[model samples]
Target: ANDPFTIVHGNTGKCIKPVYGWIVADDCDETEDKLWKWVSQHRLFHLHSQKCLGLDITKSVNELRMFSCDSSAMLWWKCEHHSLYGAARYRLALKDGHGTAISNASDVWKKGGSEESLCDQPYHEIYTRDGNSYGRPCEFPFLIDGTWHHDCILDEDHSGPWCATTLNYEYDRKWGICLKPENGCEDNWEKNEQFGSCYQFNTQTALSWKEAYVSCQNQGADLLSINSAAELTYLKEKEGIAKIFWIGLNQLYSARGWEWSDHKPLNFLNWDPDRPSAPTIGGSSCARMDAESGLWQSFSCEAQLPYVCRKPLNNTYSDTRCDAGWLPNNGFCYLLVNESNSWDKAHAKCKAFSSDLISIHSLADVEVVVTKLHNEDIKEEVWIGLKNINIPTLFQWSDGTEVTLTYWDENEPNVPYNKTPNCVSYLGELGQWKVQSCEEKLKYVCKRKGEMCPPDEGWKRHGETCYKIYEDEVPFGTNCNLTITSRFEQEYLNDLMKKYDKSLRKYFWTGLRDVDSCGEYNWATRAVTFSNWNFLEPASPGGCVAMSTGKSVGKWEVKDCRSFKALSICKKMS
Candidate 1:
């Protein structure tokens, strides 16, 4: 008999699934307990809970050892138990089994598909119920929660096969997710369960509907997969900081998923207007993600824009209300302290609170935060916002938002320029660059902004993360190149899986391609540990095999490497 794993330990507490569900763009309330409560209740609520109910019910008294038939099981546990009662804890992870040649494993493989096979898809999952004629329980050996027994698949190294998956859950955001085929893609589930973050990544990642899935295969993780929050919290503890940063909380299928990569549910979120609407006929729904704007806006995953990559859970962001006349964004706040003190004194004031005067970046930015500081009465010179005084020459802005087109007065550096320009001035009258004595006292702008340095969560303003895609549409991070190679690279993935979970299986990724007909899609990791072989053994066909697996979990066969398929994966660090 295999070792028994407690679905819900009578001693330890309840069960635990790693990743939960899709993430949505929403201004979720900033309350830790509130989020957790939401996930907990979600599991019990049974809102959008769509898993083939009628399959039967069985309350899990102990670690399930094949007693599937109580018909008295909990909502999910045919033996009953577990995603965990929460407001937002769900993730529909599509999976593919490893070594399809095994017996009955065909249930894990594609059945009556038309086109062909998809290479290396993720594994699917299932639970064994009692009253079945297959095999007996006590025959194997093992059980959880003070129970005992086992069956065929319950051998030592294999344990109860969850189809290569962990549970996903997140108390921080809202989300909804689905597999590529829109049907059952169970086989892929088992193979990827090996990935430490399969549950987490499967749930919280903001990848396109299709790309989200591909990433799991290539990086040994799957689209975030999970049922409740109990499992989510456990997975997070395992992921650790700066690793498997991906979390599920994006709305790709409109509002269908609402569960976090970690199992947490949300009754409501700050969703965009009319969001989660049905997708256009032929086009499958694309998840909307906007870490900056705090709303999931729909966009095809194949289309490019560097995704918002984030590590696992972190300390809650601390937000302070802007003093006197300031406002806050995310965890940052701002206020213009009257320049009653000289430049030196102003810097001291900012440093007093461990903050600095807000730096001016552009006319538009000038109109954003500090715009509140502008007044007509005072004629005294105000300080130009700037940061970084540890070293004299290294001047930066408080928020680090770029000061693109500078408006420096002509020849402003005059003689104070050169290394001697120890003191700085925004002298709007001088236009741009100007220098002054370090000790000189002048009325400076008391711009106060920024999160405490080394952001507790390594978070930044989404608005400042990247360049503009349009007058009002500025993309954060690498929001360009939707190419297959760019998918993983833009997502800052590939190497991350290995970095996040050393135990992950490094699969081959379509990280690099011959866009210009350069030939042979080279392996991005080349280090063997980061490569995932397509089951089809894609060995470069007639310069094209059309990696169409993005839409369907087809067969596994090597096709042309340069084929224009929707397949893609990102490099951890290109």
Candidate 2:
């Protein structure tokens, strides 16, 4: 058995079959695990699992057991004296320890639609060098070609002459394991056993669904393959922040029906309640998960979003997440400043947090910001690190990275007379660029580099995370902070804002508000530490915090809490 082998059922779409752990069958093609060795003294040892095949008479007399070579007696067998098709086959009529005969109540493994369990004994027990048997295990010792047998054309239980396969793994139909046929070192791919597939979530850049699919294929993977509600729940219940992501489901080929990247049937779906109403203009055929509901939404194949890639599992992501407010992406932590500030102040605040305003180096990096920050909440342009510090001379990022990639809106940098702009802001929607004076105030996005980042209650669990939207859509100045204590907690509330609000113009009361000091805010569980204050007048002395409803969401503004009637967000340590 020192030859390459791939056992498959004659009737199971010619799928790959394995001998360990119940003769499993799957579309996972010819892997090293499919190789085996037939040792002297009736032992079949598979290299992948490092186990030997033996008779499991105690479990069920006729069942074959893959166990340690030292257990019980091995499968002592005899091969037919002569080779008919240049192959030697064996029959185990007698166990070396006992007289139990190995027979074929012989059925195909699970995928082959076998009627009997793996343990049933059969009536006719014979081995022919003519073919591979789907009902019985075989070992070929003389074939120089080193071919493993998958299918055998047999007559019946009584059996006539057997016919073996002429096809090899290389010529076998290359059916994709999931969606697109891809390659990867299974040991290196990140695996999540829950989903039964490995994944690579790229936060560094944005790609249209097709681009993401091709990207994964290049890396021997496909766009994220979500096959069940359990997988969809994993994404929905994921914590810290909310943003758009490209998943494997799409209508690119079907045009009217959803299908996974692999040719799997569309057995599950979790579309936003409004998905049917969402516009699919401009040949929208791809699917994306938006922050609005964590449900799938359709978009053009060219519409870009950060994506998650899936491959056959071989390995969890070992990378880390930044602290609560900070998000890990492309080897950096990004924080969207909910409060608008002068370019200088924004730069200073980021540095104060051991980070700097975002430095856009790639289109993927830019998409991370656009998909996460665009929408009802942010009604104004947000500042980035791009600046004209030299005044009309050149532009560069605050992190000192060279400014080569750019996405300036048409006719941008339209400087007005007497106003020499030195700062840049990413305008709403697609994050187009605009020039602004350094002193002007607007929301800004920041970036930091770090890892390791989780759980609890609204008082209600949506999978693992908990959330509760308070009934009072108003605030009281006395109890300024809601339940939010950490920046990440606030981030969740930011996502909830647009989700619960329909007008996209509503504001709400939050736990964070300006103190007499103006720069710091209090939390529900701990002493005041962080703030998301918008640059407001008088720096707002003793003002209550007001979170945006729709316009300028994910931001805070100072106002008399008692004077407003907006809703409040309750944050619990989850």
Candidate 3:
């Protein structure tokens, strides 16, 4: 006979064992109580005791126990495999008409039984709205539209937690609501739809007005700002008014009237009676709200009070001007290269995309770059475009932009006693720059003027030209009229062809042909100024040109115009 097996719990990492007449989870061992054999008719029979496992249905809690094999009706069980949090787990349920599953609740286990429930708990069996099992398991980090989501989220303005059913949801167009409980907002924060932001009410600790503002700033937020009567009413009803709270509205010494800390105009007011009295000399100028009545009043800036902080949620906005994975800010699009490479090599990589290593021309540019790095949770130093590699004493941007602004750390641009540290790197944690050797490898940022290309898949933009490689083979003169004007364009197409599978034929028909005259190749669409013919090629007259890949890649060769058929490279102005 084969050896007995033990059932282990996924969450607790413990083995199910029979203790006396009850079943409980404990450390797995070779003891007879932990070993159970799978007999005919899906019964789990204890090996040493010669008894089958059964649920005690008479009790309110369905406790599991060892019973005689004759009671096969209660001993039958069904096990199903599940994927949760990217790991495999097994769910055991009674095979009887009442399909209550064995749940892993703490209280139920204390009673020497697992809970008999449907899907109320996270670890229980999940069912669709129509009471049918879901067709496929939910995939984490699934691709939707063009972005990859790592968790089940409330997207597309859906009220409930939902996730893509397949890894490529954009193509499959399949999704389902998640059965597990999902807290809509981050811990300690509540979503406010009116303002499109999340708010955190801190009632446990009290701080002065300035101290509270700093605390909120540390958390990437600002003290609460009441923008309208609707917002005030919503806060009063949902957040509850129990005590005084510091608000962002205040009259600074330099300002003539009250204003919000975020620099927005004060458009709405919920002032208590007799409020807005002229500020007393050396007295309160900050705003405080009465938690009980939901009315505001002027108070001393130094007074301590619990506060509420507000920050914008992670909202998705589409910019058609920028390509996917590039963030648009002002007039430029920025892309963060997560791979580590030397500064020079990073610059070359950016150049390959018709862009340059990022250049900061103003404080706003610095903020844009820093905010992107912060949102990505990047902590290491990243290469920027500033360098003095050529002149050593004078620094310049790689894109030839004037260095009108700089955010250097203390003692930065520090030159070693003899060696020159020419390249610059940005430290996101400090939001400052430091000089380093150009050869040092690090992640980088690339920037280029924002421009949209053709929305079709496989099309790539280079300057004003959009190029696409079609896999279908066509005769030499059958609409194969993409002219190559410069060596840059020819080289670009040559490199782009390398991405295709090597198993396919490498030759692609170009518009160049010398049918009009021998040794005088002219493009069918226009006159050609540049040509990359292979050595000893163009040896025949009245023939068409085709670009070859593989051993002698990117070289042009001649073939009979009518009989030769090859792939096509198409180009058009974006």
Candidate 4:
């Protein structure tokens, strides 16, 4: 069953027409020589002349001619196919007997170059849309001939040999490896290949510094941080014109003058040199990058600005869940069990996951853990880490960190008359914490350090603590042992976090805890009263705490002891 087709030039978009018994790319219309067929292998039988494409052996020019397709090698050929731009474009290269490639020099058809000299052949197989495309063998053979490509320019003439097939038949092998993807980015993220990270442009709505910071943390992202001139330059492309956008840099906490949302020190400042002179006016010290010039300047933390969210380029996950079902947050990962169990019973189950009964830090953390439970639609009071198991006003972390932050329901944390709700339970609908008895059987949340950072090279000495950033980022860990002993050292490490490189991590274990013999709170150094805790007083019975780095920067939370391992910084007194 011969099918009518046309041979068109890959670049010129002209069809092959017979001129004086020779083939030339001259017309795109469905005229005589432009109409061809596959009478058999190695042959393109022209319907107008009733002859196959064959070489004129007598002519010194070695031009091709229309001759009988009598099963001769001159009329026998095969087309090999390849893909480009991840299948955005398909191509085919031709091979004939005598090992010569089908040639198209100057957009004219004349078969002669050797198979090995495909580059020398200088032409490709131009696929046409007006061919009989029986289904089993081909696809998209004729979108009504895909309207011809006469409008495209001819500058692509120098491209390597390719073939375009418009047949409903078996095809040559396809080359799949050489072509690259259109853009290998995760959903809603655009990859910055040069910087090795992905960025999300939050254009839907503007947000204030506080809201924006928590929003990124909620989405597992953080406001953008520019660590170097090159990174600033790269971010400049996204700045657009004069749109001032909120960056992660700010002086939100006095302990550190100006810090990134991830708590990295402000090592590379690029202030708008021409914005006259300015200083912190009325506590307006959060940072913004000029969309016009890529310069930085401080603004009121309450000022709203559309922002960019930065996610690690290599955002990876683990097959080994902290348990069968655990979720990750900034510095912690959790597992929610929806079964009846005592605080100690749940404690045993949490131990299998290398974590313990949950102790929460911020309301943001509260919401995150609640959401994980809500996803399972399991919203009920569950045993938490807080308890009067030790004594009143002296609560402890199940693991031994001071419970500084709180989200207790209003007018709460005080025991009812003649009753002690020693263990706490999170009320889902109310979005608040309430104390309960540990003997009750209910659901439970297990907490652990998400993952550990891989080991790294060298170190940065700041005050008494020596920090090292890993080339490969560690996941959230159940416990991180690196604690800055003093506020000054904390400030020192904050500035140096991204000093050597921009891709350092957050979530370190500090030597700070509330694990004194009497459940007294203390830092490894002089335990300060400078608290950024959500709860005003301690609540957990006995737990150790981990200081945060990136997404949960500067915030402290208590967790169960021997329940977690995190990216830890090592310190020795100077």
How many clashes in each structure? 148, 25, 1, 50
Give Cα-based local distance difference scores for all models.
0.30, 0.52, 0.61, 0.50
CA deviation > 4 Å runs, candidate 1: 1-320, 329-331, 361-363, 377-379, 385-407, 413-421, 427-433, 445-574
Q: What residue runs in model 3 are displaced by over 4 Å at the alpha carbon?
A: 1-458
Q: State residue 442's C-alpha deviation in candidate 3, in Å.
A: 20
Residues 1-574, candidate 3: write the lDDT tens digits.
1135565554454666665755666776766676754554445566656566676555445555677665533566543222111001112422221222345422111111232221112111111111111323355445554444544578566546666655457677666654342235565467868688878776644467776665565455667987666678677776543378889877542112355665443434555544442443445678888766777777888876777778776657224388878888767899999888999899999999889999986444665677664455556789999876431134678999766554555334443323444788887443567768888889899998884555576677554567777866667867557787755466456546644523224478888887665578888855666767888988798898887654345678988776566788887763
Q: What is the lDDT of candidate 3?
A: 0.61
* TM-scores, each model vs. reference: 0.21, 0.25, 0.27, 0.30
* Tens digit per residue, CA lDDT, model 2, 1-574: 2233443333343433234344454554556775544443445555566565555545445554466544564454332221101002222322222222333312232112332211121111112221222112222211113433322233464234332322222343211111222355343245577777776655434466665665565455567755555676677676532378887766553212345555343334455544421343645667788644656666777865677767665545346577886666756878888787898899999999899988886545665686664445545888989875332124668899766444454334433333444677877445667667788888888888875113332354322235566645444533234644445445446546645653334567766555555555564335656656655632566666676643244667766644455665543334
lDDT of 1: 0.30
Q: Rank by lDDT, highest first.
A: 3, 2, 4, 1
Using TM-score, rank the candidates from best to worst.
4, 3, 2, 1
Model 4, 148-259: lDDT tens digits are: 1111112344132222233321343221110011234554468877777777665533467765665565445678887666787677775433367788876553232355
User: Which residue pairs collide in model 3, if any?
Assistant: 284-300
* Alpha-carbon shift of residue 565 in model 4 (angstroms): 10
